Design an enzyme around this catalytic site. Sequence first.
Site, PDB file in Angstrom:
ATOM      1  N   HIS A  63       0.952  -1.384   0.122  1.00 60.14           N
ATOM      2  CA  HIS A  63      -0.329   0.096   0.130  1.00 60.14           C
ATOM      3  C   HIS A  63       0.975   1.316  -0.593  1.00 60.14           C
ATOM      4  O   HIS A  63       0.158   2.375  -0.235  1.00 60.14           O
ATOM      5  CB  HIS A  63      -1.009   0.044   1.377  1.00 60.14           C
ATOM      6  CG  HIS A  63      -0.045   0.273   2.870  1.00 60.14           C
ATOM      7  ND1 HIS A  63      -0.138  -1.030   3.284  1.00 60.14           N
ATOM      8  CD2 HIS A  63       0.503   1.753   3.070  1.00 60.14           C
ATOM      9  CE1 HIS A  63       0.116  -0.439   4.875  1.00 60.14           C
ATOM     10  NE2 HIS A  63       0.654   1.123   3.998  1.00 60.14           N
ATOM     11  N   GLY A  79       3.067   5.555  10.153  1.00 61.07           N
ATOM     12  CA  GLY A  79       4.750   5.181   9.476  1.00 61.07           C
ATOM     13  C   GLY A  79       5.769   4.370  10.226  1.00 61.07           C
ATOM     14  O   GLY A  79       6.501   3.671   9.431  1.00 61.07           O
ATOM     15  N   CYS A  96       4.459   1.183   9.281  1.00 55.21           N
ATOM     16  CA  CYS A  96       3.901   0.214   7.817  1.00 55.21           C
ATOM     17  C   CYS A  96       5.427  -0.429   7.381  1.00 55.21           C
ATOM     18  O   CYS A  96       6.821   0.309   7.823  1.00 55.21           O
ATOM     19  CB  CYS A  96       3.253  -0.091   7.205  1.00 55.21           C
ATOM     20  SG  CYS A  96       1.393   0.034   7.933  1.00 55.21           S
TER      21      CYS A  96
HETATM   22  C1  LIG Z   1       1.238   2.122   7.855  1.00 50.00           C
HETATM   23  O1  LIG Z   1       2.305   3.447   7.969  1.00 50.00           O
HETATM   24  C2  LIG Z   1      -0.085   2.135   9.077  1.00 50.00           C
HETATM   25  C3  LIG Z   1       0.412   1.782  10.384  1.00 50.00           C
HETATM   26  C4  LIG Z   1      -1.329   2.547  10.949  1.00 50.00           C
HETATM   27  C5  LIG Z   1      -1.420   3.841  11.173  1.00 50.00           C
HETATM   28  C6  LIG Z   1      -1.791   3.553  12.936  1.00 50.00           C
HETATM   29  N1  LIG Z   1      -1.624   2.786  13.312  1.00 50.00           N
HETATM   30  C7  LIG Z   1      -1.207   1.794  12.377  1.00 50.00           C
HETATM   31  O2  LIG Z   1      -0.299   0.532  12.489  1.00 50.00           O
HETATM   32  N2  LIG Z   1      -0.574   1.408   8.193  1.00 50.00           N
HETATM   33  C8  LIG Z   1      -2.334   1.866   7.546  1.00 50.00           C
HETATM   34  O3  LIG Z   1      -2.355   2.737   7.576  1.00 50.00           O
HETATM   35  C9  LIG Z   1      -3.275   1.413   7.059  1.00 50.00           C
HETATM   36  C10 LIG Z   1      -3.438   1.448   5.517  1.00 50.00           C
HETATM   37  C11 LIG Z   1      -4.599   1.639   4.772  1.00 50.00           C
HETATM   38  C12 LIG Z   1      -5.167   2.362   6.392  1.00 50.00           C
HETATM   39  N3  LIG Z   1      -4.166   1.569   7.600  1.00 50.00           N
HETATM   40  C13 LIG Z   1      -4.895   1.563   8.990  1.00 50.00           C
HETATM   41  O4  LIG Z   1      -3.878   1.078   9.673  1.00 50.00           O
HETATM   42  C14 LIG Z   1      -6.986   1.328   9.071  1.00 50.00           C
HETATM   43  O5  LIG Z   1      -6.823   2.436   9.493  1.00 50.00           O
HETATM   44  C15 LIG Z   1      -7.123   2.342  11.401  1.00 50.00           C
HETATM   45  C16 LIG Z   1      -7.742   1.665  11.182  1.00 50.00           C
HETATM   46  C17 LIG Z   1      -8.442   1.884  13.305  1.00 50.00           C
HETATM   47  C18 LIG Z   1      -7.757   1.988  13.431  1.00 50.00           C
HETATM   48 CL1  LIG Z   1      -7.539   2.283  15.963  1.00 50.00          CL
HETATM   49  C19 LIG Z   1      -6.357   2.971  13.487  1.00 50.00           C
HETATM   50  C20 LIG Z   1      -5.790   3.743  11.987  1.00 50.00           C
HETATM   51 CL2  LIG Z   1      -4.853   4.659  11.209  1.00 50.00          CL
HETATM   52  C21 LIG Z   1      -3.478   1.013   5.015  1.00 50.00           C
HETATM   53  C22 LIG Z   1      -5.070  -0.353   5.748  1.00 50.00           C
HETATM   54  C23 LIG Z   1      -4.205   0.477   3.773  1.00 50.00           C
END
Ligand SMILES: *[C@H](O)[C@H](C[C@@H]1CCNC1=O)NC(=O)[C@@H]1[C@@H]2[C@H](CN1C(=O)COc1ccc(Cl)cc1Cl)C2(C)C
EC number: 3.4.19.12
Lengths: 306, 306
Positions: A41, A143, A145
């Site tokens: 992503h 950040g 991921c």
């Molecule tokens: C990549 O750095 C992030 C890590 C996230 C950010 C907050 N906590 C994490 O672990 N990954 C994402 O942003 C992914 C990305 C799109 C959505 N996403 C999510 O983590 C979904 O969102 C959330 C869902 C629940 C909560 Cl409590 C918070 C968040 Cl930010 C992909 C799914 C494409």
Amino acid sequence: SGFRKMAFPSGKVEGCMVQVTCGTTTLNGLWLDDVVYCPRHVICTSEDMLNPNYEDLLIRKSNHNFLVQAGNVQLRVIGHSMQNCVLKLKVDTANPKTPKYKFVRIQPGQTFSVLACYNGSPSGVYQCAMRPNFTIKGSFLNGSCGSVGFNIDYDCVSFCYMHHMELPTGVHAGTDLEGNFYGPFVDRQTAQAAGTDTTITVNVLAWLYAAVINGDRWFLNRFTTTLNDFNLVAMKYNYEPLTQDHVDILGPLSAQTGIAVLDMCASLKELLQNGMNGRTILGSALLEDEFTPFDVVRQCSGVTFQ
Amino acid sequence: SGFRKMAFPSGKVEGCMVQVTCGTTTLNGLWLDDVVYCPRHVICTSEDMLNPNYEDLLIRKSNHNFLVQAGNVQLRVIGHSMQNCVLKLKVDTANPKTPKYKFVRIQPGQTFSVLACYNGSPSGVYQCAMRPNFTIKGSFLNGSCGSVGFNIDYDCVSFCYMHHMELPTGVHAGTDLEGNFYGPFVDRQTAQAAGTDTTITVNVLAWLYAAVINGDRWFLNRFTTTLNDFNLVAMKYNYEPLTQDHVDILGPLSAQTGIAVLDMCASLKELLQNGMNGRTILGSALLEDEFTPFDVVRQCSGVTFQ
Ligand SMILES: *[C@H](O)[C@H](C[C@@H]1CCNC1=O)NC(=O)[C@@H]1[C@@H]2[C@H](CN1C(=O)COc1ccc(Cl)cc1Cl)C2(C)C
Ligand SMILES: *[C@H](O)[C@H](C[C@@H]1CCNC1=O)NC(=O)[C@@H]1[C@@H]2[C@H](CN1C(=O)COc1ccc(Cl)cc1Cl)C2(C)C
């Protein structure tokens, strides 16, 4: 003595972490030999991450769109491909810090160390378990991921986890290093949820053995129980069933303490029905389930890694 | 989100760990530039470690009695000297992996990461706090002496702890890297004991703020309290007094959550008098006191280290 939630030394993994930037998305990559692995992503944008079509998105990309920062040195990307939910960025330089490694997929109930990273820089290290519902209770911000989870076995790093996302309950979901998600989650922004978890019974017993080894004995008793009668109590308290193999795996801990596995089950039964009554076990007022029998043997015996 | 007991990445410290063997004692040493630091009781034997006279023992030693193993490579010792309770072994080779570092002494209440080591090889990493009674609740077996505790601040490792011993309650005691013990302990086998501990009040409040940031709010209330009336409750429950400086240090967490420090005290007061009533905070059924305000800000904001 003592018993702590202990991670593996992270140095071997720290030398693999890089920063991957594409468009306005920055995340972490894992650099092994001449490949950088990162969540796919990264190729998405704001209006992309809804119901994206990653094959379409990826064919529109160019090698030069991927900025790869290995510390203060830029890595030239010379090829890219998608493998399930990860990207493989072929770079012109092999990582001279590449440890010997494996890509392994773990089972719910197993543990691993997470090296949390931001902008390719390691922030901290902690121990996690794969929950029965294929989530992990981590600590992850924007950040993070591409941070990986791993185990170490002598000199070999077994990578088991790449971070992709947080779910609405505050728990975390990701893939193995072949890009296959743990559990029924997708790398889209949908209304997906964890779904019901259970307590890892065999791990709780291991931790009870850790407690006995360390001198906490107040929960022991002369009672015993059969596996079947224990498992009716386990089910009632939303604990996972205990199998004969779990009993076998607990054998060495049983033999060291001299407490039969089924006798420790009888102790767990009483703790489940009575609670702890204001007492603690290994500094915890809850039955802990994120230590495997291996984790207990390792810590209560002192194995290292070269 | 999420909140975990998180250690610093250990790689910079892993590159400093060596094995020191003298007579039939093997322990860990810390190799920085051309000096190896290790606990002085390595020069002792079985009948020595009772009421030893280390100056007498050390003058009877020779440079060649000290076997220093840096992985699979032996380090020639070219000088030795004692500094309080540590030995400084001058070796013929400077550690090319020497990170930039400092020797700092920490305050009770502060936290650090421990890299547990055996035979010069890192085994695991975990977070500890210096207890008010100058012990640490660690995980240490035979052979772990010379393992160090540390913090990292950008690229600089601040070494604060060297492990020397376990006390009869299963807690651990050691020195700063200048060889001065934390607390009233000596590196002899006497009948020394920890003595009474207290709970680190300012840390519990920080952890309550960590909980609010992460969505645990059930312990909040409209009540408030004065610092003085809070401190009479703290004393009653064997908590450390809260100072105005503690209130100041909690300011940024207060400002982020919008919960006044003194209002969070009122919440802690109620938790102390009523308990939790079957609920948990950040996955804990106990009030946790091994997270500093810094630790909470760091994790709930994502700082890294290069
Ligand atoms: C990549 O750095 C992030 C890590 C996230 C950010 C907050 N906590 C994490 O672990 N990954 C994402 O942003 C992914 C990305 C799109 C959505 N996403 C999510 O983590 C979904 O969102 C959330 C869902 C629940 C909560 Cl409590 C918070 C968040 Cl930010 C992909 C799914 C494409
Ligand atoms: C150095 O490797 C060891 C580390 C110890 C061993 C078990 N746990 C540890 O942290 N240090 C020592 O053996 C020092 C050494 C002499 C005694 N000693 C002790 O740790 C005291 O002992 C114990 C006290 C209490 C318990 Cl619960 C266990 C032990 Cl082994 C010096 C004091 C000279």
